Symmetry: D2
Subunit: 376 residues, 4 copies
């Protein structure tokens, strides 16, 4: 049936995303020395200050301040005229804290309870829903043209939102686009709107989806000079829908950034994405949602549901069987299936954990095996 | 299907309750205040930050300690003490270049304060029109009023987590296939006497639903000793339980957190309105399950999208539903506030045991169902 | 006997003095609404952040953030290139907390124990010791030429130190001068030294005391661009010797800033200065040190010692008698004798609480009465 | 004359002990580390900030909690708990544009790291050559080792303050004219039984000095109930007891704080050397009372001033003393370090009950007195 669906994203400069990146920069720094470290790093950014807290247990020795300043600096906050300066902001630290419980580590019980969802759809090339996919690309393009000097008056903080029109489960076009970007005093709003349209929006959104009825809200309130942590708190794990599927799929409720792979909240979400994407990549369904749940201390998932919204190209009972045959969804089994014990997570902390074809859980190395195990 | 909840002693929930305690305190004096209160709780301290624009004069430390006493932290043995903990505040005033004054001759036409997407959901699986798993997870952890009325004080400590795994045949509840209840306790009780008291003293609200067949896996303290909890050895932030606050995974979510936000923040008020729309659609008999998505663009009063999903359970053409909602509900940001009468200090009660399913809240009223049913042409 | 004596001072931009000024700016803001408020405000300034804490009890409603930013801004830290920005630094608050115990408030017992010292000497016009006096004037002159644009490349943080040569208890000249000033990248060290000599040192130090043997250490280590809270913590009450007599006199050990006048640690120190200065101003002695001590809950001082280092012009027993006849040294008696219940204390928090002739405890309105009560 | 001291339970002293605990921990691994550790203690939290340049890897929280346990805060009833309090750190690394490497072919010729003035003092009023009032104020509050060895645990809480008021005739001790001892206590003792136990159980170190004539005013808990103390309801910062740390008001002070500073900070090492010079002058019989002032200019190795004050008690021309000190002591910043053997983790013990008067410290040695007396030509 005809309907609209909307998703949003934010740039690496949005204060919530700043916190997520700092949390995963600390995780990456620790994993490079202690691949098996336990990390639960919560970050809280506000005017003038970064607070890094949580609980950690590792043999690694890390400089929290240096990691934090480097991260903020890469994001681009390097001057008080931007509202935040990586070189002079305060950095505060408030981090704290059986061994071989299984003969086979792959049989360790879940370190926590919870349910996670994976999703895939052949709407886009990356098998992600269209709204979240192009919302990410808009804020990522904003950062791209900000850093390479194409538009030097841009500033780090920005938000996007895309409203897609669907009909009979197929995409007809784009109904509304929102893009709010921080900027310096130099540029006027008229010049800003045209440059964002020409350098950010038009190069990213397929023209076939842009009709005369599409609304374009470019800095709808106008002046956007004060941004980032100034005038807006940022906390880790406050963008979990931006991080996953933009609302197209359900969500178990767990945040990703700041957590080592032993947190099923994170790695099982990655594994769920890995199965759903391989099912859709194998031609076994157009759209596929995977629900997995874990009981603490239990290795086998307490539930595995495969929903294909009537788009399955083989019986539903055979899909759920293939999922069990080709994927190891035990907490520490999926860690090895995805090779998650490496410092690869700072890159996930902005622009979406799902959609980019270089992360382990985005590989489709099992798609050909799945359709072979089903016929075609 | 599986869904989980947490108690008022959980650190994340502590942060929500503090943020809404601060909000409620401000609304008592300035019902039109702008509040964005973000709370951080860690071993030994509370940090309350954010931005507020109000004429009210409140006491953040006093509000914070009172919130923590009620939750039941008044001694260092529990791992946290509301009387001796540290309370830091980092709250700024009016963010420059925002409040442009009147702006609109009709205040109901004001633009939204931010972009964003919100979801509402209703299902006639229960007399409160909520999804089954999440609904009784709250009532489970909420029966800790026994430890306040001295019904049974014993050994239980606040921090708790529930998980119920149902299974469906044709969208109908088959039964309970797995119950996970992990609770913090004291040293004055063993894991054997614990798991027996846990499986017995959780039945008074859980109803005579003997859905626990011979194939229902129970996990009461499956890991073992659970003595240290709360902020001690675990960090809590507001807005880190948004799936617990809403529909426990059954319905989708837009990502916005509720606590610490005044009603002019669409992230909260529009989620409430979405629940108000879906519950009234179901209550009116126009559908058995209903999910609503709204979205806003900053500075725009009209929602940029409205989607009504009935999952094939509608009793009237779906396009008709979308039109009924557009006219029978005022989904403009400041029309929601008037439609729900939201400018009141009612939000601390929400930050604890679910924002939906408790029918004394304005967005739980089904005062439009009959009107909707009449306009829909049924009967 | 011949000897050298040295004292130091710091500018309003030195991080310890930043904390003192913030503490007394909060005190002033409270006293303007609640003259009888109880204030004990401790401030802690570091890279990017100001922490204001302590214990207060008042009917006043004050905006700690606004008071703090205004204070830092007046000091001059307004840009991340200076290492600190009043507009974007973090401000954290950690403030907490019988009535009519006496029929006559003047008889209330001391709110705390302690001993305090006052000092006066006719060496200088303001009846202060020479070293501390001119150390203050150097850093105060540094700030004066920084703000009025005479030397716009100066920055707020600076330190001074003057070594005086004494002989037979009389001043012969100045043996060494140290002046370290923060500055921007623009100025080179050679140009900086000459400008500090011409605009700061020479206009302040009497030429009769500057001989060819006087050492001048102007930015002895050279480059001084990073200053203020960056690279150096500041805490309230860490300059108590700069605040009093530069070491020429003994010190009871109590800090001034952040305390309301009910803290004998502060107001009794002021009263002691008031008596010593009036004794010297009356011609009753060349140099005079006053020691007073208080027992908690006791109104009358538990000791009053008057030391005149052999310079007394009347018998010692008569000086101590005159002190008791003309000065009310009870805790709440000296408050009324000096009219201390007004927001006058932010001005004391840099450049010395003693020496400036507009504070109440620097008035010599009793000098003529003292010498009349003794003859001449 | 009057002088006061405080115990290791006083919040300011807690901050000093933490700063030197951190310093000592670093020196154990890097004896040449640069440390400037500033500690803030408030109800429920410790904030450890400053700057350090070291190759050592320490644990600030672990060091902090251990320091607070020893002081005796392990339960929320005392107002503070070392196991549940918050510990924040804000410690930066090498301040840019400072360490220029070698700089000098003879390391003893390095310039001072900062300007500043320092005082030392010695008097033969006591076998430790310290002023009377302050010397036994420390030993008073230090006898709280009874509450550690279970000698007498009872009701006393850490926070305590002493004050003794002597009087002089011709520089000779006449007697005690006023004793003020206010101590924090528990609810398991009244102010009557308190003041009796306070006046009786403080005599074991106070010696048979019955200087308490009929005119000696005693003030034991003169205000009354003293139950809440420590960081609870009172703020503590390092370097806020510098007169207690030194000579209790008898001698003058340069303003620099000791704790949290490594020996290359003249604010500490030169104050120690000043005490070393004065004590050796008195011990050698060259004077009965001696006060020394030194000062430094940043980047200059030679003190910018040295003043010897004998208060008329010298037994040799005063100008000769100033010359003897210049040659028999190396008062250059890095010569002090070698002269006193300061690159060792010995500083936490100083942050508690006075930096001077305890003869096992390097700066309390009188190993030059005889040499000084020989060079002075006496006997
Ligand atoms: O109560 C029960 C629950 C499950 N079972 C059976 O356990 C079987 C599952 O075996 P398994 O977990 O070892 O298979 P798996 O592929 O998931 N193993 P891996 O994850 O690839 O390592 C099921 O066939 C189920 O019928 C019972 O017999 N009784
Ligand atoms: O034990 C004692 C101590 C003091 N005294 C006497 O109290 C007298 C002090 O009186 P006072 O305190 O009222 O005089 P004052 O000028 O200080 N009063 P004010 O501070 O100006 O209000 C002294 O003369 C002293 O001899 C005793 O008789 N016995
Ligand atoms: Mg926020
Ligand atoms: Mg949002
Ligand atoms: Mg410092
Ligand atoms: Mg100093």
């Amino acid at each position: 049936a005809k309907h609209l669906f909307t998703s949003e994203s934010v740039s690496e400069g949005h204060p919530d995303k700043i916190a997520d990146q700092i949390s995963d920069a600390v995780l990456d720094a620790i994993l490079e020395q202690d691949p098996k470290a336990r990390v639960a790093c919560e970050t809280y950014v506000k005017t003038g200050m970064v607070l890094v807290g949580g609980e950690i247990t590792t043999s690694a020795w890390v400089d929290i301040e240096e990691i934090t300043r480097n991260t903020v600096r890469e994001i681009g906050y390097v001057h008080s005229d931007m509202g935040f300066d990586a070189n002079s902001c305060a950095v505060l630290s408030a981090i704290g804290k059986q061994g071989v419980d299984r003969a086979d580590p792959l049989e360790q019980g879940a370190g926590d309870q919870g349910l996670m969802f994976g999703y895939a759809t052949n709407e886009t090339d990356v098998l992600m829903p269209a709204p979240i996919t192009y919302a990410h690309r808009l804020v990522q393009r904003q950062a791209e043209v900000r850093k390479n000097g194409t538009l030097p008056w841009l500033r780090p903080d920005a938000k996007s939102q895309v409203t897609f029109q669907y009909d009979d489960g197929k995409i007809v076009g784009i109904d509304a686009v929102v893009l709010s970007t921080q900027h310096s005093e130099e540029i006027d709003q008229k010049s800003l709107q045209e440059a964002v349209m020409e350098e950010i929006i038009k190069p990213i959104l397929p023209a076939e989806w842009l009709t005369s009825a599409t609304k374009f809200f470019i800095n709808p309130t106008g002046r956007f000079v004060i941004g980032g942590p100034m005038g807006d708190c940022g906390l880790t794990g406050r963008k979990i829908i931006v991080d996953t599927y933009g609302g197209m799929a359900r969500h178990g409720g767990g945040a990703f950034s700041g957590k080592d792979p032993s947190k099923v909240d994170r790695s099982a979400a990655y594994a769920a994405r890995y199965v759903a994407k391989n099912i859709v990549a194998a031609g076994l369904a157009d759209r596929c949602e995977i629900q997995v749940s874990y009981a603490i201390g239990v290795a086998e998932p307490t539930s595995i549901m495969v929903e294909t919204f009537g788009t399955e190209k083989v019986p539903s009972e055979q899909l759920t069987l293939l999922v069990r045959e080709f994927f190891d969804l035990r907490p520490y089994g999926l860690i090895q299936m995805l090779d998650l014990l490496h410092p690869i997570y700072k890159e996930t902390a902005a622009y979406g954990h799902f959609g980019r074809e270089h992360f382990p859980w985005e590989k489709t190395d099992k798609a050909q095996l799945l359709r072979d195990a089903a016929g075609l």
